[PDB]
Amino acid sequence: SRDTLYEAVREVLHGNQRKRRKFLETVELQISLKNYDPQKDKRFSGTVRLKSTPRPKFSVCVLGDQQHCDEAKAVDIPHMDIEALKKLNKNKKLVKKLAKKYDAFLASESLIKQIPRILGPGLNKAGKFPSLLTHNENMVAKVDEVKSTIKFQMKKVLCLAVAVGHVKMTDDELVYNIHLAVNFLVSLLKKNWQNVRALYIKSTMGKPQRLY
Amino acid sequence: SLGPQVAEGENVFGVCHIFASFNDTFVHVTDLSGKETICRVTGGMKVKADRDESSPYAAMLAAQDVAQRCKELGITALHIKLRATGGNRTKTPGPGAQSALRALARSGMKIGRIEDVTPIPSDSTRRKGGRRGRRL
Amino acid sequence: VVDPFSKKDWYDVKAPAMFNIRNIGKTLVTRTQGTKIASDGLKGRVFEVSLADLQNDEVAFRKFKLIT
RNA sequence: AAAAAUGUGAUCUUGCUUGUAAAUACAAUUUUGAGAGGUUAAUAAAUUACAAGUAGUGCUAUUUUUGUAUUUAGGUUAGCUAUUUAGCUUUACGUUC
RNA sequence: CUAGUCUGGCACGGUGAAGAGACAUGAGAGGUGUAGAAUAAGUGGGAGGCCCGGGCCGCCGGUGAAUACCACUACUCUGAUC
């Protein structure tokens, strides 16, 4: 399952063909998935950790009550302890909005003794299901998920996605994370009979045009 | 085995070399030329007793089983070239000539040109058996 | 594990302009297989055909031959 | 009937592949027409507590009255003899149970 | 044990035509579980962006994963190859 190279992955100084839109484009990485079963427990999912800002940002909630309350005040979000857990239970049903007022969540390690009951087919069918196969812990991962760290999930119908920078971002933010999102997205390996085929470039919007 | 023909006015012709010596029955359907072979069967295939393999019933048991396998490829008409042992031995045909030919007139086939095709000489090598005869 | 009267396709035969009826009959040969062709072997038959069936109403005793 | 809900981060347990462990003939039929060689050479099937992985499902719980309900109780194939009274086939209606 | 004799391989030792394949690189078609006004292929898609002061496919009602433009694999037929 081996690529290496690092020969001279300079030369994105023809990359104006990526950004044609008015807004800023979310530059990406995605290899097509050979060597893979749908339903099984052939668990191909670590949680690769980058260095500098690809910026995955969605509205995070801290459901932790030991060291997860103290060390999740560094990002500085008005903490809500027992009326954050009670808000999702029968409060806003007849009022037209859903009872959440959240987006992201914690795969519970601080409240691991209060975890095993209801929450199954609301989050799971949606695919916003909080795990530690993708840094949903919200304490030291509140300074990494919102800004730095990343994953590649496991599921039935055979799919992938992962970031490195943007097109705000400059040549410092394009190539030095490409060095850490290739070593670390190669060693992560089942003696996979080389899905090492070709690893494609990507942004926010379009049609086919290939690279390695 | 499906020959393309006009469904309501054409029968596919052929020829059968009917060998008829006294000690065995033979029937042998071939093409117009005679070169290939489609449906061959003897009296020996049917009956099992050395003395009665060429008998008129051991000549009729073969001819029905020609026309069974001769009606599944789908042939209707046939030319004929009968025999008798011949050469420098008997030229009168054997007891598998009419009971082999009249059987296929009842078993779903048409009859066309008939003749003899014995071997006959202009003259011959000396014949087996003595000057003094075959005593019995 | 085989049926021998599949590998046989029905072709046609002809006669020259000097005799009356054009269509004699049919003949069967194997396909292009191993190393032998279906138009190489099919080039030297003899059809010992009469005259009556070749014409409208003749004396039938004469015969003929017509090689490919 | 009515299921509200405080309810191990609003409900719920049901999908599936596998290990041991425990239950499958009248007379047959083929065989071996034969007291036995070969009632061969088929079969089916069949259920579950645990060990890694899924279609599906993300795996805990107080109560009130329940049906005032007795911890909710009995029955039938009802067959006919003569005009009603009177009598009484365990369900043969191949015959007997 | 062995000189000779028989047999295989490997080198000197190259060109063309046709028969039948493997196996790939560059293309054109190529998608109807229920359901949705509409042939349900998979993911980060995503309320957004192209041209020629304006349009359009959509957000929307909805099924257990939604129409623009960056990426090619599961899967099925097409034929030319330095």
Side-chain angles (χ1 to χ4, degrees), chain C residues 11-22:
Chain C
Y11 315 137
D12 210 65
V13 191
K14 296 286 163 190
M18 62 205 169
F19 304 131
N20 223 55
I21 295 158
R22 179 66 72 170

PDB file of all heavy atoms in Angstrom, chain C residues 11-22:
ATOM      1  N   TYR C  11     -26.479 -24.868 -46.621  1.00  0.00           N
ATOM      2  CA  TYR C  11     -26.147 -24.100 -47.835  1.00  0.00           C
ATOM      3  C   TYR C  11     -26.929 -24.654 -49.044  1.00  0.00           C
ATOM      4  O   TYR C  11     -27.651 -25.648 -48.907  1.00  0.00           O
ATOM      5  CB  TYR C  11     -24.630 -24.141 -48.107  1.00  0.00           C
ATOM      6  CG  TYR C  11     -23.738 -23.904 -46.886  1.00  0.00           C
ATOM      7  CD1 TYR C  11     -22.595 -24.690 -46.665  1.00  0.00           C
ATOM      8  CD2 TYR C  11     -24.021 -22.883 -45.963  1.00  0.00           C
ATOM      9  CE1 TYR C  11     -21.775 -24.476 -45.562  1.00  0.00           C
ATOM     10  CE2 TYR C  11     -23.207 -22.667 -44.855  1.00  0.00           C
ATOM     11  CZ  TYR C  11     -22.085 -23.466 -44.662  1.00  0.00           C
ATOM     12  OH  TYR C  11     -21.274 -23.256 -43.572  1.00  0.00           O
ATOM     13  N   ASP C  12     -26.783 -24.014 -50.211  1.00  0.00           N
ATOM     14  CA  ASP C  12     -27.543 -24.369 -51.433  1.00  0.00           C
ATOM     15  C   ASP C  12     -26.632 -24.890 -52.565  1.00  0.00           C
ATOM     16  O   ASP C  12     -25.413 -24.707 -52.512  1.00  0.00           O
ATOM     17  CB  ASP C  12     -28.339 -23.146 -51.915  1.00  0.00           C
ATOM     18  CG  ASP C  12     -29.622 -23.522 -52.638  1.00  0.00           C
ATOM     19  OD1 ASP C  12     -30.524 -24.096 -51.992  1.00  0.00           O
ATOM     20  OD2 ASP C  12     -29.729 -23.248 -53.848  1.00  0.00           O
ATOM     21  N   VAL C  13     -27.232 -25.544 -53.570  1.00  0.00           N
ATOM     22  CA  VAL C  13     -26.519 -26.080 -54.757  1.00  0.00           C
ATOM     23  C   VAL C  13     -27.206 -25.604 -56.056  1.00  0.00           C
ATOM     24  O   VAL C  13     -28.415 -25.354 -56.056  1.00  0.00           O
ATOM     25  CB  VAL C  13     -26.466 -27.635 -54.738  1.00  0.00           C
ATOM     26  CG1 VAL C  13     -25.503 -28.172 -55.798  1.00  0.00           C
ATOM     27  CG2 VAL C  13     -26.073 -28.153 -53.357  1.00  0.00           C
ATOM     28  N   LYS C  14     -26.432 -25.477 -57.144  1.00  0.00           N
ATOM     29  CA  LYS C  14     -26.941 -25.004 -58.453  1.00  0.00           C
ATOM     30  C   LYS C  14     -26.502 -25.877 -59.640  1.00  0.00           C
ATOM     31  O   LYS C  14     -25.599 -26.710 -59.518  1.00  0.00           O
ATOM     32  CB  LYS C  14     -26.502 -23.551 -58.701  1.00  0.00           C
ATOM     33  CG  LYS C  14     -27.074 -22.529 -57.726  1.00  0.00           C
ATOM     34  CD  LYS C  14     -28.548 -22.256 -57.987  1.00  0.00           C
ATOM     35  CE  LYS C  14     -29.228 -21.583 -56.807  1.00  0.00           C
ATOM     36  NZ  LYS C  14     -30.708 -21.520 -56.961  1.00  0.00           N
ATOM     37  N   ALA C  15     -27.166 -25.665 -60.780  1.00  0.00           N
ATOM     38  CA  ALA C  15     -26.874 -26.347 -62.052  1.00  0.00           C
ATOM     39  C   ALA C  15     -26.675 -25.296 -63.165  1.00  0.00           C
ATOM     40  O   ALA C  15     -27.159 -24.172 -63.030  1.00  0.00           O
ATOM     41  CB  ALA C  15     -28.014 -27.296 -62.400  1.00  0.00           C
ATOM     42  N   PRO C  16     -25.967 -25.651 -64.267  1.00  0.00           N
ATOM     43  CA  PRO C  16     -25.690 -24.657 -65.331  1.00  0.00           C
ATOM     44  C   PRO C  16     -26.912 -24.293 -66.195  1.00  0.00           C
ATOM     45  O   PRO C  16     -27.981 -24.888 -66.037  1.00  0.00           O
ATOM     46  CB  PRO C  16     -24.599 -25.335 -66.173  1.00  0.00           C
ATOM     47  CG  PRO C  16     -24.791 -26.795 -65.954  1.00  0.00           C
ATOM     48  CD  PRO C  16     -25.359 -26.964 -64.571  1.00  0.00           C
ATOM     49  N   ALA C  17     -26.741 -23.324 -67.096  1.00  0.00           N
ATOM     50  CA  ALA C  17     -27.842 -22.826 -67.942  1.00  0.00           C
ATOM     51  C   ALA C  17     -28.314 -23.794 -69.049  1.00  0.00           C
ATOM     52  O   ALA C  17     -29.415 -23.623 -69.577  1.00  0.00           O
ATOM     53  CB  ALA C  17     -27.474 -21.478 -68.552  1.00  0.00           C
ATOM     54  N   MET C  18     -27.492 -24.787 -69.405  1.00  0.00           N
ATOM     55  CA  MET C  18     -27.836 -25.772 -70.464  1.00  0.00           C
ATOM     56  C   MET C  18     -28.927 -26.801 -70.093  1.00  0.00           C
ATOM     57  O   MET C  18     -29.641 -27.280 -70.983  1.00  0.00           O
ATOM     58  CB  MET C  18     -26.571 -26.476 -71.016  1.00  0.00           C
ATOM     59  CG  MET C  18     -25.740 -27.310 -70.040  1.00  0.00           C
ATOM     60  SD  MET C  18     -24.015 -27.467 -70.567  1.00  0.00           S
ATOM     61  CE  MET C  18     -23.254 -28.177 -69.108  1.00  0.00           C
ATOM     62  N   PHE C  19     -29.045 -27.138 -68.802  1.00  0.00           N
ATOM     63  CA  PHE C  19     -30.161 -27.953 -68.278  1.00  0.00           C
ATOM     64  C   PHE C  19     -31.280 -27.043 -67.753  1.00  0.00           C
ATOM     65  O   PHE C  19     -31.055 -25.856 -67.505  1.00  0.00           O
ATOM     66  CB  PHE C  19     -29.691 -28.901 -67.161  1.00  0.00           C
ATOM     67  CG  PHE C  19     -28.559 -29.822 -67.561  1.00  0.00           C
ATOM     68  CD1 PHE C  19     -27.421 -29.943 -66.757  1.00  0.00           C
ATOM     69  CD2 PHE C  19     -28.634 -30.591 -68.723  1.00  0.00           C
ATOM     70  CE1 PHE C  19     -26.382 -30.794 -67.115  1.00  0.00           C
ATOM     71  CE2 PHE C  19     -27.595 -31.439 -69.084  1.00  0.00           C
ATOM     72  CZ  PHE C  19     -26.468 -31.542 -68.279  1.00  0.00           C
ATOM     73  N   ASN C  20     -32.474 -27.611 -67.565  1.00  0.00           N
ATOM     74  CA  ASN C  20     -33.700 -26.815 -67.356  1.00  0.00           C
ATOM     75  C   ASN C  20     -33.794 -26.188 -65.948  1.00  0.00           C
ATOM     76  O   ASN C  20     -33.676 -24.968 -65.811  1.00  0.00           O
ATOM     77  CB  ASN C  20     -34.963 -27.650 -67.677  1.00  0.00           C
ATOM     78  CG  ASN C  20     -36.006 -26.876 -68.471  1.00  0.00           C
ATOM     79  OD1 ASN C  20     -35.721 -26.339 -69.543  1.00  0.00           O
ATOM     80  ND2 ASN C  20     -37.233 -26.844 -67.961  1.00  0.00           N
ATOM     81  N   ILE C  21     -33.993 -27.014 -64.917  1.00  0.00           N
ATOM     82  CA  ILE C  21     -34.208 -26.520 -63.546  1.00  0.00           C
ATOM     83  C   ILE C  21     -32.860 -26.154 -62.904  1.00  0.00           C
ATOM     84  O   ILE C  21     -31.868 -26.876 -63.053  1.00  0.00           O
ATOM     85  CB  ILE C  21     -35.006 -27.538 -62.681  1.00  0.00           C
ATOM     86  CG1 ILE C  21     -36.428 -27.709 -63.240  1.00  0.00           C
ATOM     87  CG2 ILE C  21     -35.077 -27.094 -61.217  1.00  0.00           C
ATOM     88  CD1 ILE C  21     -37.107 -29.003 -62.849  1.00  0.00           C
ATOM     89  N   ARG C  22     -32.848 -25.028 -62.194  1.00  0.00           N
ATOM     90  CA  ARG C  22     -31.635 -24.466 -61.589  1.00  0.00           C
ATOM     91  C   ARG C  22     -31.319 -25.101 -60.226  1.00  0.00           C
ATOM     92  O   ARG C  22     -30.166 -25.454 -59.966  1.00  0.00           O
ATOM     93  CB  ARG C  22     -31.786 -22.937 -61.465  1.00  0.00           C
ATOM     94  CG  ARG C  22     -30.623 -22.179 -60.830  1.00  0.00           C
ATOM     95  CD  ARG C  22     -29.340 -22.219 -61.650  1.00  0.00           C
ATOM     96  NE  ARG C  22     -29.419 -21.400 -62.866  1.00  0.00           N
ATOM     97  CZ  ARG C  22     -28.393 -21.107 -63.671  1.00  0.00           C
ATOM     98  NH1 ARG C  22     -27.164 -21.553 -63.415  1.00  0.00           N
ATOM     99  NH2 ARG C  22     -28.595 -20.350 -64.751  1.00  0.00           N
TER     100      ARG C  22
END
